[PDB]
Each structure stands twice: as structure tokens, then as C-alpha cells.
Design a protein around this ligand. Structure first.
Ligand code: HEM
Ligand code: HEM
Ligand SMILES: CC(C)(C)OC(=O)N[C@H](CS[C@H](Cc1ccccc1)C(=O)NCCc1ccncc1)Cc1ccccc1
Ligand SMILES: CC(C)(C)OC(=O)N[C@H](CS[C@H](Cc1ccccc1)C(=O)NCCc1ccncc1)Cc1ccccc1
Lengths: 442, 442
């Protein structure tokens, strides 16, 4: 408990922690409800304990910019430790300090405007596979699971954008890594001292059978992101090369299909926005013209729909940085070892910044009203040197999928559609019941 | 084993490590013999594994200066992690990086030339208690255990030099902390991942009964080193104050009596040096004059005796620094996490630097021959910003004890004297059998 007197000493308010457990019993309603409740109880700053780990939550936009941007390289360089990872310690999202800096610098030129412009005529293929597979499940009066057909699409994109492997994600044969994307973490906070125990037993969060399903696949491409790695600080090792491919597969698959599912739920439960977005798509792309890089960046209402959905459902929920040494940001002492946390979900739904924050209103992001939005309150991709490096790629992939789908189909709520949607009362930001909707062909 | 291929990759030679154990089975002859053997087998540089921890030994004087002095603050700032320590993490010899820098800067003015000059007329008291207690055990024909009566003296000095507590160390009553100075570490190298487990069970290397024998004693002196702490970077906390007192007690007690025991063994087994040193003491201090600060610094042969003994018996044996990031010192790549080690015992007995290194010859340190001695080969107190901060104090205390003792007594080997002396085939640099000698009154 000796560390549970930290916030009491610093005069920082917060819920009283129980011995050993801290405040983790409050996660029984999920991180999000616990964050919004503390935001209401304690105000701009509060602390709690993930077991013995003190966590200081900050909501001041200036203080948030200081942590994420101004003092990132010096004090707030790394995220909360995560284990056991095995060789995934060399992953960019996990790597720390100097190893992270080397990985970030040599992986940043992967998501430039030029590299993304090269991937657009390639992603267009699986948009048609997405429509034709949707055409089958839609031509029959059978409600459709979005994250299934969206997940099949998201799989198709990430294998080719970074490597070159092309598969219709209903081939169902030799190289689906569904084994890769296939509660013990509750003990990570109670037993973070057991991370060193498990890191010597080869225990990873995914088994060694999967992380060799692709480890060999990388070597056969001695014969895109895979290319750019062997093309390029000390050069990329062959195993580091492997670890970043894994990070991109998780990111490009789980985030894409999940956000697209939240988007289509919003359009179905708001028929006006769906019709308005369908009008804009028909105007920029008449005769169902194929979307391109520049035409995707021309659709303003499409971007307003995407941003507003990301406000309601920020899949990260929280942004975190480890305070690597004593600091005093914006007039507040922060001792070493404290985990600094930014409650993105809570700030995205704060009534003090958003009128009717529970309502889905894309007009918040109109160029008339977008200016009234603080970039350090709305942070769906983070901020600063450790923001989402695949942000521009993620937006481009999702919009290309929406354009081609809304060009051919309309979406209505079915009898089994969960309205209003329940968020997963568990850890990662997902819905409780999967999203199902009726699909009609235009 | 995955880390056991490190030195094989780097082309660095060394003994082949067994799985899990590494090369720790070779410590069965002690660190010293293993170091000297590797020095002979592999030359200037070699590596081995304390379990899964790679340890690179360097013997090049330039490379040693680079580690200890030139690149100390930047790369080689901390020692090998030590556990479990409890609150002793705040101890200066244990503390790391910025916390160490703050502790070093605010504790350095304790061992100045001026502060040491103030402690000399106080240490002179227990030199007489040392003689009178020696006078009893010497007036009777009963061989004497040095580390007993030296340990009683060393205890007397450290309590007063830093606090003000005066005790005849044969009072045997209320405040002897023999409980403080009262094989499980073999598992520290095989289970360094268990250090985080034990650090939450309040398990220290000394029990909580002892580390509260003095924790309360510090507070009663709200009512010397204890004074200088409350007098003084953020100021010294009250518990940090406590932790450095503990470090000084261990250092000032165990090192002092052990070195003095090795010294008196050398003088007894070399009657010429003992007579020559007794002559010099009688010349600087005629009529058995009391030794002072300046008169102690005038005796050259006394310093030659002390330095040569420290060459044969460097109680640290090894100097270590943790490589905190990839470096290339003197043209050799050193990857992050590697523990850099300097085998002081091996270098002090290297025939390539010392003619007849096993022989006790104080004339190596005559001002005629001292110049031929490399300060990065002979490092009894370390070097650089993390050298022994109590070096000047340790030399002064031991010399004041030797002067007063050699002024009144001569020392002859007894029937039970271990000749030649056997070093403890175990961990810390001690003799196997305790040192006993005959004592005659002058
Ligand atoms: C809707 C889609 C996505 C969202 C909302 C999202 C959001 C985020 C957020 C909030 C962070 C943490 C930022 C911070 O801590 O300041 C992050 C990190 C990251 N994201 Fe994304 N992400 C998405 C998709 C992707 C994709 C497709 C990739 C493909 C490579 C990707 C790669 C990464 C990486 C590598 C990091 C860690 C960067 C670093 O630590 O240097 N993300 N993302
Ligand atoms: C014959 C007596 C002594 C010898 C040979 C000795 C030797 C050493 C050595 C070799 C080191 C490590 C240096 C390095 O790693 O570069 C050290 C560190 C240290 N010694 Fe001594 N020591 C002696 C007595 C003392 C005494 C009496 C004190 C009293 C305070 C003391 C306090 C310290 C401290 C605090 C450190 C750690 C310094 C730091 O890490 O900043 N030592 N000693
Ligand atoms: C400390 C705390 C738990 C609070 O948070 C995290 O560490 N949780 C994730 C967990 S690892 C995951 C992939 C993985 C999994 C096992 C081993 C190696 C690698 C990843 O790499 N990304 C997750 C999705 C995602 C990516 C990119 N963009 C957006 C979303 C890591 C993470 C990293 C950045 C932001 C949020 C979460
Ligand atoms: C990593 C490795 C084991 C190879 O080495 C070390 O850590 N072993 C010692 C161990 S802790 C000891 C006191 C203590 C003990 C338990 C908890 C807290 C504190 C200390 O503080 N000093 C030991 C004597 C001494 C001091 C001062 N001067 C000369 C000799 C630490 C140490 C530090 C510097 C140099 C050598 C050894």
C-alpha cells in the first residue's frame, strides 16, 4: 500500500484504493464510465491506482499538449509497460526511448502522401470484392454482420498494402492468419511483477505457432512496407521487420472493421445523414465513378461523418505516457514512475465542450463549426511524436470502403439491431452484440 | 538461452554458458580465480553470463577510463541491479541516474579535507580504547583475533563520526547494532526476475527489526554527517537521510576492520616492513606523540604499506557499470543492457603489470617507482564520478588505528596463524580462517 499514499500527499483527489487491488474494482463498468464519473467527481485532475501503479488523469488542454507534444522526447516518451511480449518488445508501439526513435524515423516514410497515393489504385480492387460479397448477402433477405464482411475486407487490404499477398477473404484456405487475430490481463495490474517471470517462459499473448505463421513468410519474400524495410540509424533487422508487420496487421484489421461497423450503425439509425452522404458521393463520383486519392479528399461530409463517429467511439479510449523523471508541468508536480493518462472517451463526451455529446451530429465538424473544437480535446489518433502513424492510411482505407458501399447499398435497422448500441462493458472498445443491419441494393 | 548467443555474434571470446545457469558454475573457485583464468585464456576482453545476464570484462586501461570516467554520466551511470532492497533503493551506492546525482552532490561535502580534519581529534579517543583493550588481551599470553578488536574499534568510529554516539565497544549493552552487521544470493542471478516478486513482500537482506533499530534513532536527533543532512536539489528526506547512514555503517565497519586485518597479517609475516614502519612512526611522532591530520599525511611508508595491501586485497574485487544504451568505446561495440565489468583483483595481480605480483613489496609505491603504476590498473577505490566517496575517510581512519597500535605493540605469527593466508573461496573478499597473531607490548 506504501504507494497508495502518493496522491494523498500531493493533495490530488481521487477514489480511495483498496489494498493490493487499488481501484481496479471500479472497472466493473468499464474504463469509460469510471473515467467519466471521476471527471464529474474530481474535476480537471485526479489520481487512481492500477494495483500499485499510480495513474494521474489530466484533462487540461494545455497540460495535455505539454505531455504529448512539448515534453514528449524528454519525459513522456513511452507508454505503460505491456507484457509478456517476447520478441514483440521490438514493436514500434511497444518499443521505448532510443529504440523507438530509430524505429519511428525509419518507418515514418511508409505513410507519406506519396506512398498512400500509390496504394489507392490497389485498394480499389477489394472494394469491388466487398460489394460483390455484399451483393450476395444482400440479394438474399438475410441480415448482414458488418464486422464479418468488413473484417474480410480489412484483411484483404492489409496483406497487400504492406506485402503483396492477394486473397479473396472468402477463399478460406492456406494463408488466412485468423489464428493471429484470434481475462488474464486482469492480473497484469495486480501482478506486474510477474511480467519478468512470464518473459522467460516464451509465453506471449499469441502462441509461437502463429508468430511463426508469418516469421517464415517474411523470409520467402527475399524472392510496399515489406519492401521499404529491407531497403532501409542501423538498418532494420530481419526480426524487427517481422514485428512491425504484426503491429500493422492488428492495427489495420481490428481498427478498420470496428470503426466502419460503428459508422454504418450511425448511418442506419440516422437516415438523413446516410442520404446526404449518398448525395455527396453521387456528386463527386457521377455514374458510380471509381474513387481516387484526390476525390476521397474532396468529400467534406464524408470526413464529417468519419470524424463525428470517431468522437463517439474513440477505439483507444485512453492515451498514456510514463513519466520517466520528476517534472512540474503547467504548475503541477509529477513524480517519477507515475503513469499520465488522458481520458479520450470522457473528453469526447464532455458536455462542457460538446452540446448534446451523446447525439450523433456530423455538423460539429462543418468548416463553419469545426473551429470551435480543441485539437487537444478531440484526439482520436493521439497527438505529438507518438500519435497514430497510420492515421492517414486508416482514414483513406475506411473512406474508400464507405464510398463504394454507399454507392450501391442503403442500410436499415433490422429487428435484431441493438438500438441504442451498447458498448462492450469490457476492455477494448467494441459493441456488446455484433452490429447487424438490413442491406438494400440501389 | 536466446541471449547466450550475444558474445558469439560479436566475435567476443569466452567460456560456453550452460542453459539457465550461464557460467556461474565456474564461481566454485570464487570470482577472483575465475577472472584470472579468463584473463589468461582470452586476453584483454571476454564475456560470460550470470544466468541470462551478459557480462563483458574489459582490461584495457584506455577502455576502463572511458567507462568509469569519460562516458560515466552518459552511458555507464549505474551498477548492476541489486535486490530486494526495500527502501534501500534510495541508498547512494544503489540509487540510479538522476536520484544518484542528487544524492551524490548533496553528500559529497561530507568527506572534504576540512570535514575530515574535524574528525581527527575525535577518532583519537577510540585509538586509545583500542590500545587499552589490546593491552588486556596482549598482557595475557592469549592470541588475539584482529577483526574482533578491529571490528570493535571500527564500530566505535562510525557511530561518532556521523552522529555523535560514543560507546566503548565492550560495553555490550543497549545500542550495539550487531544485528545490523549480522547463499540465497546465488538465486539472484538465476532468478533476477524474482526480484520484483520479493520487493512487494517487504523482504530485505536485513529484517525490518534492524532497519527500525536506527530508523527511530534518527528521529530522536531532532533533539557530523547526520547534522549535514538535515542542514541540506530538493533537500534530503528524513528516510533518505536514514538510508545513507546505513550505507556508511556497512562501509565504515566491514571495510575498515577487514583491511586492517589484512595489513597486520602482512606486517607479521614480514618483520622487516613492520620494523621499518615502526621506525617511521617513532620519527614523525617521537615520545609516542598523538597522531594528527597533517602528521598522518606525512608518513610515506605508512601509505606505501596501505596501498600495497590494497593491491593484494581489493575488497571490491570487481567494478561494474550497466551499459544504458548502445555504445562503441575505443572501437568496440557494446550493446544495451550489457554489464561492463573491470576485474580489479585480477589486474592487481597481473604479472604483465607487476613483477612478482603475489609478493608483498611496499616499495612498488615508493615515489621512485610509484610513477610506473597505471591509475586505471590499480583501482582500490574505483575511479570517476562513482568512485569511493569515503576513500579519504577510510584511509585516515585505518592509518590512525595503525599508528597508535604499532606505537605500542609488535605482531608475531602464532602456531594457529594461517600462513599463507587463504582468501574466502566464497563471495566477499575475506580470509577463510580468521586472522590471529601474537601481540607483544613495546
Ligand atoms: C481508425 C483507425 C485508427 C485509429 C483511431 C488509431 C488510433 C491510434 C491512437 C490513439 C494511437 C496512440 C497515439 C498516442 O498515444 O498519442 C495510435 C498509435 C499507433 N497506431 Fe493507430 N489507429 C488507427 C489505425 C492504425 C493503422 C491502420 C495503423 C497501421 C500501421 C496504425 C499504426 C499505429 C502505430 C504504429 C502506433 C504507435 C506509434 C508509436 O508509438 O510510435 N494505426 N493509433
Ligand atoms: C578500505 C576502505 C574502502 C575501500 C577499499 C572502498 C572501495 C570502494 C569501491 C571500489 C567502490 C566502487 C567504486 C566504483 O565503482 O568506481 C566504493 C564505493 C563507495 N564507497 Fe567505498 N570503500 C571503502 C570504504 C568506504 C567508507 C568508509 C565509506 C563511508 C561512507 C564508503 C562509501 C562508499 C560509497 C557511498 C560508495 C558508492 C559511491 C557512489 O556510488 O556514488 N566506502 N568503495
Ligand atoms: C498499456 C495499455 C494496455 C493500456 O495499452 C496498450 O499497450 N494496448 C495495445 C496492446 S498491443 C497491439 C498489438 C500487439 C499485441 C500483443 C503483442 C504485441 C502487439 C497494438 O500494437 N495496438 C493495438 C490496436 C491499435 C494499433 C494502432 N493504432 C490504433 C490501435 C497497444 C496500443 C498502442 C497504441 C495505442 C493504443 C494501444
Ligand atoms: C551488484 C554487486 C552485488 C556485484 O555489487 C554490489 O552491489 N554489492 C554491494 C551490496 S550493498 C552494501 C550495503 C547494503 C546491503 C544491502 C542493502 C543495502 C545496502 C554497500 O552499499 N556496500 C558494500 C561495502 C562497501 C561500501 C562502500 N565502499 C566500499 C565497500 C554494494 C557495493 C557498492 C559499491 C561497490 C561495491 C559494492
Amino acid at each position: 500500500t506504501h504507494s497508495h499514499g502518493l496522491f494523498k500527499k500531493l493533495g490530488i483527489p481521487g477514489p480511495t484504493p483498496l489494498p493490493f487491488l487499488g481501484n481496479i474494482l471500479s472497472y466493473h463498468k468499464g474504463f469509460c464510465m469510471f473515467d467519466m464519473e471521476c471527471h464529474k467527481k474530481y474535476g480537471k485532475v485526479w489520481g487512481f491506482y492500477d494495483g500499485q501503479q499510480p495513474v494521474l488523469a489530466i484533462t487540461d488542454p494545455d497540460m495535455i499538449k505539454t505531455v504529448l507534444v512539448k515534453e514528449c522526447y524528454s519525459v513522456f516518451t513511452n507508454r505503460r509497460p505491456f507484457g509478456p511480449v517476447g520478441f514483440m518488445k521490438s514493436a514500434i508501439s511497444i518499443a521505448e526511448d532510443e529504440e523507438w526513435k530509430r524505429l519511428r524515423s525509419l518507418l515514418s516514410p511508409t505513410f507519406t502522401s506519396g506512398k498512400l497515393k500509390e496504394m489507392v489504385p490497389i485498394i480499389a480492387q477489394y472494394g469491388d470484392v466487398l460489394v460483390r460479397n455484399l451483393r450476395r448477402e444482400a440479394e438474399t433477405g438475410k441480415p448482414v454482420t458488418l464486422k464479418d464482411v468488413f473484417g474480410a475486407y480489412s484483411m484483404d487490404v492489409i496483406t497487400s498494402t504492406s506485402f503483396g499477398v492477394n486473397i479473396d477473404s472468402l477463399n478460406n484456405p492456406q494463408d488466412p492468419f485468423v489464428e493471429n487475430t484470434k481475462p488474464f490481463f486482469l492480473s497484469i495490474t495486480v501482478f506486474p511483477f510477474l511480467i519478468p517471470i512470464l518473459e522467460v517462459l516464451n509465453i506471449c499473448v499469441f502462441p509461437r505457432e502463429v508468430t511463426n505463421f508469418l516469421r517464415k513468410s517474411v523470409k520467402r519474400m527475399k524472392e510496399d512496407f515489406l519492401q521499404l524495410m529491407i531497403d532501409s540509424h542501423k538498418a532494420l533487422s530481419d526480426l524487427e521487420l517481422v514485428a512491425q508487420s504484426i503491429i500493422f496487421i492488428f492495427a489495420g484489421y481490428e481498427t478498420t472493421s470496428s470503426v466502419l461497423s460503428f459508422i454504418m450503425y450511425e448511418l442506419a439509425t440516422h437516415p438523413d445523414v446516410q442520404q446526404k452522404l449518398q448525395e455527396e458521393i453521387d456528386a463527386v463520383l457521377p455514374n458510380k465513378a471509381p474513387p481516387t486519392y484526390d476525390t476521397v479528399l474532396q468529400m467534406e461530409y464524408l470526413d464529417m461523418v468519419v470524424n463525428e463517429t470517431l468522437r463517439l467511439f474513440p477505439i483507444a479510449m485512453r492515451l498514456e505516457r510514463v513519466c520517466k523523471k520528476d517534472v512540474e508541468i503547467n504548475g503541477m508536480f509529477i513524480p517519477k514512475g507515475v503513469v499520465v493518462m488522458i481520458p479520450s472517451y470522457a473528453l469526447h463526451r464532455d458536455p462542457k465542450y460538446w452540446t448534446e455529446p451523446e447525439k450523433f451530429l456530423p455538423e460539429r465538424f462543418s468548416k463553419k463549426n469545426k473551429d470551435n473544437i480543441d485539437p487537444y480535446i478531440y484526439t482520436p489518433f493521439g497527438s505529438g511524436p507518438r500519435n497514430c502513424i497510420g492515421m492517414r492510411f486508416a482514414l483513406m482505407n475506411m473512406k474508400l470502403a464507405l464510398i463504394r458501399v454507399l454507392q450501391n447499398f442503403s442500410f436499415k435497422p433490422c429487428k435484431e439491431t441493438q438500438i441504442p448500441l451498447k458498448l462492450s462493458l469490457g476492455g477494448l472498445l467494441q459493441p456488446e452484440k455484433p452490429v447487424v443491419l438490413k442491406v438494400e441494393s440501389r
